[PDB]
Amino acid sequence: SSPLLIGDSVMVDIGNVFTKKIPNAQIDGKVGRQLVDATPIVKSQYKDYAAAGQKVVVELGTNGAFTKDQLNELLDSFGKADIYLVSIRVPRDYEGRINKLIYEAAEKRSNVHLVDWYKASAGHPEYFAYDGIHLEYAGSKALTDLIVKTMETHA
Ligand code: NA
């Protein structure tokens, strides 16, 4: 009902569509944001979300690669919150490596739930701008629906 959504350009793209579905969502998207820049923000802005019973959506990696250690530092900073971690689809050589880090984090952590946008958007070029980074409306609605459906299942 009041989840935190933190991400890069993709969060900017879906913010308005997502707010129509979940009006009390707290949305923090910034074009060009790197995952390593999110951890100080969570400590400066969002420690009230780092609690059992809170919900956080993390949408990072589309705008740049990150390391295992950086991902773990970010996930640890949310504490016992339920974390919905979105896989990425981007035309860059690091896409697979980052998606494997994301997959393994979800495998490990009982409070991390994978939102497999990579799999969901396979075969749907109409979801994406020609740059393969920004989303068309059809993509923003599909990703919004996937995030919300995952949170409603608790999966
Ligand atoms: Na998990």
PDB file of C-alpha atoms and ligand atoms in Angstrom:
ATOM      1  CA  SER A   1       0.000   0.000   0.000  1.00  0.00           C
ATOM      2  CA  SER A   2       3.008   2.278   0.661  1.00  0.00           C
ATOM      3  CA  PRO A   3       6.020   0.489  -0.866  1.00  0.00           C
ATOM      4  CA  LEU A   4       9.341   2.131  -1.574  1.00  0.00           C
ATOM      5  CA  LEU A   5      10.471   1.912  -5.207  1.00  0.00           C
ATOM      6  CA  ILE A   6      14.113   2.827  -5.823  1.00  0.00           C
ATOM      7  CA  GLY A   7      15.730   2.611  -9.216  1.00  0.00           C
ATOM      8  CA  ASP A   8      17.331   4.216 -12.233  1.00  0.00           C
ATOM      9  CA  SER A   9      15.887   5.372 -15.557  1.00  0.00           C
ATOM     10  CA  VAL A  10      13.461   2.448 -15.582  1.00  0.00           C
ATOM     11  CA  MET A  11      11.959   3.648 -12.303  1.00  0.00           C
ATOM     12  CA  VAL A  12      11.526   7.092 -13.841  1.00  0.00           C
ATOM     13  CA  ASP A  13       9.827   5.502 -16.842  1.00  0.00           C
ATOM     14  CA  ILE A  14       7.302   3.523 -14.800  1.00  0.00           C
ATOM     15  CA  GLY A  15       6.744   5.955 -11.912  1.00  0.00           C
ATOM     16  CA  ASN A  16       3.588   7.599 -13.231  1.00  0.00           C
ATOM     17  CA  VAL A  17       1.982   4.320 -14.357  1.00  0.00           C
ATOM     18  CA  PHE A  18       2.907   2.693 -11.039  1.00  0.00           C
ATOM     19  CA  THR A  19       1.484   5.602  -9.000  1.00  0.00           C
ATOM     20  CA  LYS A  20      -1.840   5.224 -10.816  1.00  0.00           C
ATOM     21  CA  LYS A  21      -2.048   1.603  -9.617  1.00  0.00           C
ATOM     22  CA  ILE A  22      -0.507   2.157  -6.145  1.00  0.00           C
ATOM     23  CA  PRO A  23      -1.144   5.832  -5.265  1.00  0.00           C
ATOM     24  CA  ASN A  24       0.747   5.807  -1.950  1.00  0.00           C
ATOM     25  CA  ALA A  25       3.945   4.328  -3.424  1.00  0.00           C
ATOM     26  CA  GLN A  26       7.092   6.272  -2.548  1.00  0.00           C
ATOM     27  CA  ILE A  27       9.020   6.433  -5.830  1.00  0.00           C
ATOM     28  CA  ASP A  28      12.708   7.377  -6.158  1.00  0.00           C
ATOM     29  CA  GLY A  29      14.016   7.054  -9.723  1.00  0.00           C
ATOM     30  CA  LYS A  30      16.970   8.828 -11.295  1.00  0.00           C
ATOM     31  CA  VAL A  31      18.320   8.488 -14.826  1.00  0.00           C
ATOM     32  CA  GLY A  32      21.906   7.277 -14.715  1.00  0.00           C
ATOM     33  CA  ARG A  33      21.834   6.077 -11.099  1.00  0.00           C
ATOM     34  CA  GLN A  34      24.397   3.339 -10.362  1.00  0.00           C
ATOM     35  CA  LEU A  35      23.621   0.650  -7.805  1.00  0.00           C
ATOM     36  CA  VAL A  36      26.550   1.719  -5.598  1.00  0.00           C
ATOM     37  CA  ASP A  37      24.940   5.169  -5.292  1.00  0.00           C
ATOM     38  CA  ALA A  38      21.717   3.707  -3.855  1.00  0.00           C
ATOM     39  CA  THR A  39      23.186   2.463  -0.562  1.00  0.00           C
ATOM     40  CA  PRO A  40      24.104   5.937   0.823  1.00  0.00           C
ATOM     41  CA  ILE A  41      20.631   7.119  -0.230  1.00  0.00           C
ATOM     42  CA  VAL A  42      18.962   4.308   1.701  1.00  0.00           C
ATOM     43  CA  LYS A  43      20.970   5.385   4.754  1.00  0.00           C
ATOM     44  CA  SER A  44      20.272   9.101   4.218  1.00  0.00           C
ATOM     45  CA  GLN A  45      16.600   8.802   3.292  1.00  0.00           C
ATOM     46  CA  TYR A  46      14.983   5.402   3.827  1.00  0.00           C
ATOM     47  CA  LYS A  47      15.951   3.760   7.119  1.00  0.00           C
ATOM     48  CA  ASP A  48      12.261   3.730   8.132  1.00  0.00           C
ATOM     49  CA  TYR A  49      11.713   1.218   5.299  1.00  0.00           C
ATOM     50  CA  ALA A  50      14.408  -1.108   6.700  1.00  0.00           C
ATOM     51  CA  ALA A  51      11.928  -2.943   8.886  1.00  0.00           C
ATOM     52  CA  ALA A  52       9.967  -6.172   8.953  1.00  0.00           C
ATOM     53  CA  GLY A  53       6.593  -5.608   7.321  1.00  0.00           C
ATOM     54  CA  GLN A  54       7.800  -2.943   4.896  1.00  0.00           C
ATOM     55  CA  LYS A  55       8.092  -3.528   1.146  1.00  0.00           C
ATOM     56  CA  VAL A  56      10.892  -2.232  -1.106  1.00  0.00           C
ATOM     57  CA  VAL A  57      11.235  -2.605  -4.894  1.00  0.00           C
ATOM     58  CA  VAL A  58      14.801  -2.360  -6.229  1.00  0.00           C
ATOM     59  CA  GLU A  59      15.250  -1.635  -9.936  1.00  0.00           C
ATOM     60  CA  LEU A  60      18.972  -1.206 -10.586  1.00  0.00           C
ATOM     61  CA  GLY A  61      21.552  -2.275 -13.159  1.00  0.00           C
ATOM     62  CA  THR A  62      19.911  -1.094 -16.380  1.00  0.00           C
ATOM     63  CA  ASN A  63      22.098   2.026 -16.251  1.00  0.00           C
ATOM     64  CA  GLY A  64      25.355   0.314 -15.256  1.00  0.00           C
ATOM     65  CA  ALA A  65      27.114  -2.799 -13.983  1.00  0.00           C
ATOM     66  CA  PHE A  66      27.633  -3.519 -10.276  1.00  0.00           C
ATOM     67  CA  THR A  67      29.512  -6.105  -8.202  1.00  0.00           C
ATOM     68  CA  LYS A  68      28.347  -8.863  -5.874  1.00  0.00           C
ATOM     69  CA  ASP A  69      29.694  -6.967  -2.871  1.00  0.00           C
ATOM     70  CA  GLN A  70      27.876  -3.774  -3.869  1.00  0.00           C
ATOM     71  CA  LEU A  71      24.575  -5.624  -4.269  1.00  0.00           C
ATOM     72  CA  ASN A  72      24.949  -7.286  -0.869  1.00  0.00           C
ATOM     73  CA  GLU A  73      25.712  -3.934   0.781  1.00  0.00           C
ATOM     74  CA  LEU A  74      22.483  -2.504  -0.650  1.00  0.00           C
ATOM     75  CA  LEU A  75      20.324  -5.499   0.271  1.00  0.00           C
ATOM     76  CA  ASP A  76      21.724  -5.584   3.813  1.00  0.00           C
ATOM     77  CA  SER A  77      20.768  -1.926   4.275  1.00  0.00           C
ATOM     78  CA  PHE A  78      17.046  -2.815   4.000  1.00  0.00           C
ATOM     79  CA  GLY A  79      17.181  -5.138   7.002  1.00  0.00           C
ATOM     80  CA  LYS A  80      14.134  -7.381   7.423  1.00  0.00           C
ATOM     81  CA  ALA A  81      11.986  -5.614   4.812  1.00  0.00           C
ATOM     82  CA  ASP A  82      10.577  -7.667   1.976  1.00  0.00           C
ATOM     83  CA  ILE A  83      12.601  -6.776  -1.103  1.00  0.00           C
ATOM     84  CA  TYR A  84      11.358  -7.178  -4.670  1.00  0.00           C
ATOM     85  CA  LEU A  85      14.479  -7.248  -6.853  1.00  0.00           C
ATOM     86  CA  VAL A  86      13.881  -6.723 -10.592  1.00  0.00           C
ATOM     87  CA  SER A  87      16.017  -8.463 -13.215  1.00  0.00           C
ATOM     88  CA  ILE A  88      17.169  -6.274 -16.070  1.00  0.00           C
ATOM     89  CA  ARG A  89      16.958  -6.318 -19.835  1.00  0.00           C
ATOM     90  CA  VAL A  90      19.478  -4.009 -21.509  1.00  0.00           C
ATOM     91  CA  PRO A  91      21.665  -4.264 -24.669  1.00  0.00           C
ATOM     92  CA  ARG A  92      24.998  -4.275 -22.826  1.00  0.00           C
ATOM     93  CA  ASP A  93      27.619  -6.996 -22.352  1.00  0.00           C
ATOM     94  CA  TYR A  94      27.158  -7.016 -18.547  1.00  0.00           C
ATOM     95  CA  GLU A  95      23.431  -7.872 -18.648  1.00  0.00           C
ATOM     96  CA  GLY A  96      23.869 -11.606 -18.017  1.00  0.00           C
ATOM     97  CA  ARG A  97      26.459 -11.195 -15.263  1.00  0.00           C
ATOM     98  CA  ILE A  98      24.261  -8.726 -13.371  1.00  0.00           C
ATOM     99  CA  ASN A  99      21.142 -10.863 -13.785  1.00  0.00           C
ATOM    100  CA  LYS A 100      23.048 -13.810 -12.282  1.00  0.00           C
ATOM    101  CA  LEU A 101      23.978 -11.707  -9.250  1.00  0.00           C
ATOM    102  CA  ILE A 102      20.328 -10.716  -8.874  1.00  0.00           C
ATOM    103  CA  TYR A 103      19.178 -14.332  -9.261  1.00  0.00           C
ATOM    104  CA  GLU A 104      21.642 -15.580  -6.634  1.00  0.00           C
ATOM    105  CA  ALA A 105      20.602 -12.887  -4.156  1.00  0.00           C
ATOM    106  CA  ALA A 106      16.989 -14.022  -4.514  1.00  0.00           C
ATOM    107  CA  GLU A 107      18.067 -17.646  -4.155  1.00  0.00           C
ATOM    108  CA  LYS A 108      19.892 -16.902  -0.905  1.00  0.00           C
ATOM    109  CA  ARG A 109      17.761 -14.474   0.985  1.00  0.00           C
ATOM    110  CA  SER A 110      14.322 -15.429   2.199  1.00  0.00           C
ATOM    111  CA  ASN A 111      13.293 -11.763   2.196  1.00  0.00           C
ATOM    112  CA  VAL A 112      14.377 -11.181  -1.435  1.00  0.00           C
ATOM    113  CA  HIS A 113      11.809 -12.033  -4.125  1.00  0.00           C
ATOM    114  CA  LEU A 114      12.812 -12.049  -7.784  1.00  0.00           C
ATOM    115  CA  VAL A 115      10.699  -9.982 -10.181  1.00  0.00           C
ATOM    116  CA  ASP A 116      11.873 -11.614 -13.397  1.00  0.00           C
ATOM    117  CA  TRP A 117      11.350  -8.794 -15.868  1.00  0.00           C
ATOM    118  CA  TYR A 118      14.018 -10.253 -18.145  1.00  0.00           C
ATOM    119  CA  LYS A 119      11.945 -13.401 -18.633  1.00  0.00           C
ATOM    120  CA  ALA A 120       8.622 -11.535 -18.785  1.00  0.00           C
ATOM    121  CA  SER A 121       9.777  -9.187 -21.528  1.00  0.00           C
ATOM    122  CA  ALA A 122      11.304 -11.852 -23.784  1.00  0.00           C
ATOM    123  CA  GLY A 123       9.772 -11.556 -27.235  1.00  0.00           C
ATOM    124  CA  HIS A 124       8.180  -8.148 -26.511  1.00  0.00           C
ATOM    125  CA  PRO A 125      10.267  -5.537 -28.358  1.00  0.00           C
ATOM    126  CA  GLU A 126       7.198  -3.251 -28.228  1.00  0.00           C
ATOM    127  CA  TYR A 127       7.852  -2.825 -24.494  1.00  0.00           C
ATOM    128  CA  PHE A 128      11.070  -0.903 -25.227  1.00  0.00           C
ATOM    129  CA  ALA A 129      12.286   2.253 -26.894  1.00  0.00           C
ATOM    130  CA  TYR A 130      14.682   1.701 -29.772  1.00  0.00           C
ATOM    131  CA  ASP A 131      17.584   2.381 -27.424  1.00  0.00           C
ATOM    132  CA  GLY A 132      16.601  -0.793 -25.542  1.00  0.00           C
ATOM    133  CA  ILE A 133      16.875   1.131 -22.252  1.00  0.00           C
ATOM    134  CA  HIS A 134      13.736   3.229 -21.800  1.00  0.00           C
ATOM    135  CA  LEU A 135      10.275   1.662 -21.717  1.00  0.00           C
ATOM    136  CA  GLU A 136       7.286   2.356 -23.906  1.00  0.00           C
ATOM    137  CA  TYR A 137       3.946   2.700 -22.158  1.00  0.00           C
ATOM    138  CA  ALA A 138       3.204  -0.958 -22.945  1.00  0.00           C
ATOM    139  CA  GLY A 139       6.427  -1.899 -21.151  1.00  0.00           C
ATOM    140  CA  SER A 140       5.776   0.362 -18.158  1.00  0.00           C
ATOM    141  CA  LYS A 141       2.325  -1.157 -17.729  1.00  0.00           C
ATOM    142  CA  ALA A 142       3.646  -4.729 -18.091  1.00  0.00           C
ATOM    143  CA  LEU A 143       6.466  -4.170 -15.570  1.00  0.00           C
ATOM    144  CA  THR A 144       4.112  -2.376 -13.165  1.00  0.00           C
ATOM    145  CA  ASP A 145       1.672  -5.292 -13.361  1.00  0.00           C
ATOM    146  CA  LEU A 146       4.495  -7.804 -12.834  1.00  0.00           C
ATOM    147  CA  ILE A 147       5.833  -5.999  -9.763  1.00  0.00           C
ATOM    148  CA  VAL A 148       2.368  -5.600  -8.234  1.00  0.00           C
ATOM    149  CA  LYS A 149       1.411  -9.210  -8.980  1.00  0.00           C
ATOM    150  CA  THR A 150       4.615 -10.452  -7.338  1.00  0.00           C
ATOM    151  CA  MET A 151       4.005  -8.347  -4.226  1.00  0.00           C
ATOM    152  CA  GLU A 152       0.393  -9.575  -4.026  1.00  0.00           C
ATOM    153  CA  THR A 153       1.481 -13.226  -4.205  1.00  0.00           C
ATOM    154  CA  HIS A 154       4.357 -12.492  -1.759  1.00  0.00           C
ATOM    155  CA  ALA A 155       6.433 -14.745  -4.062  1.00  0.00           C
TER     156      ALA A 155
HETATM  157 NA    NA B   1      14.446 -15.424  -1.849  1.00  0.00          NA
END
